[PDB]
Amino acid sequence: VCQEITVPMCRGIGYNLTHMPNQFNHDTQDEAGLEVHQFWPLVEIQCSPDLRFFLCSMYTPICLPDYHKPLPPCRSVCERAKAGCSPLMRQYGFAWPERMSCDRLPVLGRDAEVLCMDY
Amino acid sequence: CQEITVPMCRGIGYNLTHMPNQFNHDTQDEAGLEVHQFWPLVEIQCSPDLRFFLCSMYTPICLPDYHKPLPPCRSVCERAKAGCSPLMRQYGFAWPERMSCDRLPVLGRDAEVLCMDYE
Numbered sequence: 001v002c003q004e005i006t007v008p009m010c011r012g013i014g015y016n017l018t019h020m021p022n023q024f025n026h027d028t029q030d031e032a033g034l035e036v037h038q039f040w041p042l043v044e045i046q047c048s049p050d051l052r053f054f055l056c057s058m059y060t061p062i063c064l065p066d067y068h069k070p071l072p073p074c075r076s077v078c079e080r081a082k083a084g085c086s087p088l089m090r091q092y093g094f095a096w097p098e099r100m101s102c103d104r105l106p107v108l109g110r111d112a113e114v115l116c117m118d119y
Numbered sequence: 120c121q122e123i124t125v126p127m128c129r130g131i132g133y134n135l136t137h138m139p140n141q142f143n144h145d146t147q148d149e150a151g152l153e154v155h156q157f158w159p160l161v162e163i164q165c166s167p168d169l170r171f172f173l174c175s176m177y178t179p180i181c182l183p184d185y186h187k188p189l190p191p192c193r194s195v196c197e198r199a200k201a202g203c204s205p206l207m208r209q210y211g212f213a214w215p216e217r218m219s220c221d222r223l224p225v226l227g228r229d230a231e232v233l234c235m236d237y238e
């Protein structure tokens with residue numbers, strides 16, 4: 001079922017409803033929120049206008065009542081967030097996370113059936 | 120003029136402030152005790168501009184020889200508020216009238232009245 005997003009950083013990014021489990025097999029929004037919370041300093045410095053949406057699109061993925069196929073962000077969204085923010089993370093000892101590697105995401109419009117979120 | 124010591128407002132783009140502020144806080148410790156109550160909102164990151172906007176009022180910028188207060192531009196407040204007011208209202212906290220945006224100058228509306236913007 002669809003549930004109103006309760007992860008504070010992921011409200012006001014363009015959609016209201018999510019569903020668990022997410023990509024990472026978090027079972028609740030609480031669990032997902034406790035993890036995405038750690039990215040707040042990266043969102044604050046604005047190394048990429050895409051980062052917050054990209055993160056939320058994975059941690060609290062959009063839920064549409066009638067749609068049951070996954071709606072990941074598009075690869076291009078990941079790539080822009082990574083290009084923007086990776087150097088800064090790298091500068092603080094953090095690598096771009098394994099679970100966020102962009103090549104796991106669909107390319108926009110490559111397959112008619114495979115939809116994805118652009119920003 | 121004096122070095123900024125409230126932890127939230129260090130490293131925000133300017134280093135010096137002047138007491139009293141527009142809240143008639145006589146010390147940075149008094150000012151910081153109030154602005155730190157907003158700290159959870161900074162970590163929530165409903166707006167990247169929030170911290171700068173709050174600090175620009177609680178630990179206002181002090182400029183050598185200027186001897187006059189310099190407020191944030193209205194647009195700075197409007198971005199902070201557009202991002203964070205919805206979450207504050209949901210959590211039962213009214214956007215305080217003291218940080219109303221129409222109390223602040225619009226950049227360039229009167230060339231003689233200065234304000235700080237940011238990105």
Ligand SMILES: *[C@@H]1O[C@H](CO[C@@H]2O[C@@H](C)[C@@H](O)[C@@H](O)[C@@H]2O)[C@@H](O[C@@H]2O[C@@H](C)[C@@H](O)[C@@H](O)[C@@H]2O)[C@H](O)[C@H]1NC(C)=O
Pocket residue numbers: 004016
């Ligand atoms: C996205 O959500 C907003 C806010 O909805 C309210 O808060 C969420 C957490 C739930 O608790 C909802 O039941 C609440 O309505 C929607 O905006 C509101 O819509 C009406 C009721 C109006 O009173 C307005 O002032 C509210 O802000 C918004 O429509 C929704 N977007 C959609 C559905 O596309």
Ligand SMILES: CCCCCCCCO[C@@H]1O[C@H](CO)[C@@H](O)[C@H](O)[C@H]1O
Pocket residue numbers: 153156157159160207210212215
């Ligand atoms: C846990 C989520 C926190 C939501 C943000 C609340 C920020 C606190 O904002 C509150 O505003 C009021 C203005 O008079 C006063 O009670 C306090 O100055 C201040 O704590």
